[PDB]
């Protein structure tokens, strides 16, 4: 039946998600809450602790920013691999595939970053380190204002209590957005997204039966993420313009170039 196929699709996406993303929300929360056996993360909450934990994980502000860039580059590659596992994606016009990633990657980065965050900090280096929110927020401008927004979003988003199975479909829906600027063949993308949306709706009804409002809220989160990324790109163009001798990774420059 149709519903059975939607569950098979949900499972396929989850399995692909597990193969593409090393640190899942399940693994991350197991570390944050402290219900694991492996070596706990090294905590970085100030300049001194940062110096000490360099092996466990330019001025500090710049150094931290460059760290985020490196992780972002790795993240873009993971998301690209995941995108290629979504049924129908690799058959789309190649330029449209590029467009979908260009406009979707940062929205997915914000989404997935929340999985590794709590109200007090973020897991880094595959969970081997933990950098406090207060430490990142205390960074001199315009870097401190660059870190906080991700936490503000995480706190709100994590209140939805989604699990990895939910996230796999949510992320797929976001990537297959037929309204991204410059797409050439819209219908094939919209058709794939329509099916992914049906899969997401069923996933939420079965996995969160006591939260009827979840689907509608997630649709709104997809809309919020666009405004969120817009501000992200802006705060970044400011840094690349006000912070001299700043090095922006080629992959990131390509994604940001000519972005709405």
């Amino acid at each position: 039946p149709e519903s059975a196929d939607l569950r098979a699709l949900a499972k396929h996406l989850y399995d692909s998600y597990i193969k593409s993303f090393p640190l899942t929300k399940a693994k991350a929360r197991a570390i944050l809450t402290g219900k694991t056996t492996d070596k706990s993360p090294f905590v970085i909450y100030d300049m001194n602790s940062l110096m000490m934990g360099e092996d466990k994980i330019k001025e500090v502000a710049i150094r931290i920013f460059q760290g985020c860039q490196f992780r972002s580059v790795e993240a873009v590659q993971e998301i690209t691999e995941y995108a290629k596992s979504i049924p129908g994606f690799v058959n789309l016009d190649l330029n449209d595939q590029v467009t979908l990633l260009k406009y979707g990657v940062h929205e997915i980065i914000y989404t997935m970053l929340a999985s590794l965050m709590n109200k007090d900090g973020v897991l880094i280096s595959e969970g081997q380190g933990f950098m406090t929110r207060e430490f990142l927020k205390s960074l001199r401008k315009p870097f401190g204002d660059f870190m906080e927004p991700k936490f503000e979003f995480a706190v709100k988003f994590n209140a939805l209590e989604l699990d990895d199975s939910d996230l796999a479909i949510f992320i797929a829906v976001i990537i297959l957005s037929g309204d991204r600027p410059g797409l050439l063949n819209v219908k094939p993308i919209e058709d794939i997204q329509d099916n992914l949306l049906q899969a997401l709706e069923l996933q939420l009804k079965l996995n969160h039966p006591e939260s009827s409002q979840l689907f509608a809220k997630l649709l709104q989160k997809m809309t919020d993420l666009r405004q969120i990324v817009t501000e992200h790109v802006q705060l970044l163009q400011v840094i690349k313009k006000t912070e001299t001798d700043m090095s922006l990774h080629p992959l990131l420059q390509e994604i940001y170039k000519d972005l709405y």
């Binding site: 590659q77 190649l94 590029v98 990633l101 390509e254």
Partner: peptide, 11 residues
């Protein structure tokens, strides 16, 4: 050619 295209084409 772009970096995103290269990543997308890598089997």
């Amino acid at each position: 050619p772009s970096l995103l295209k290269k990543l997308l084409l890598a089997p």
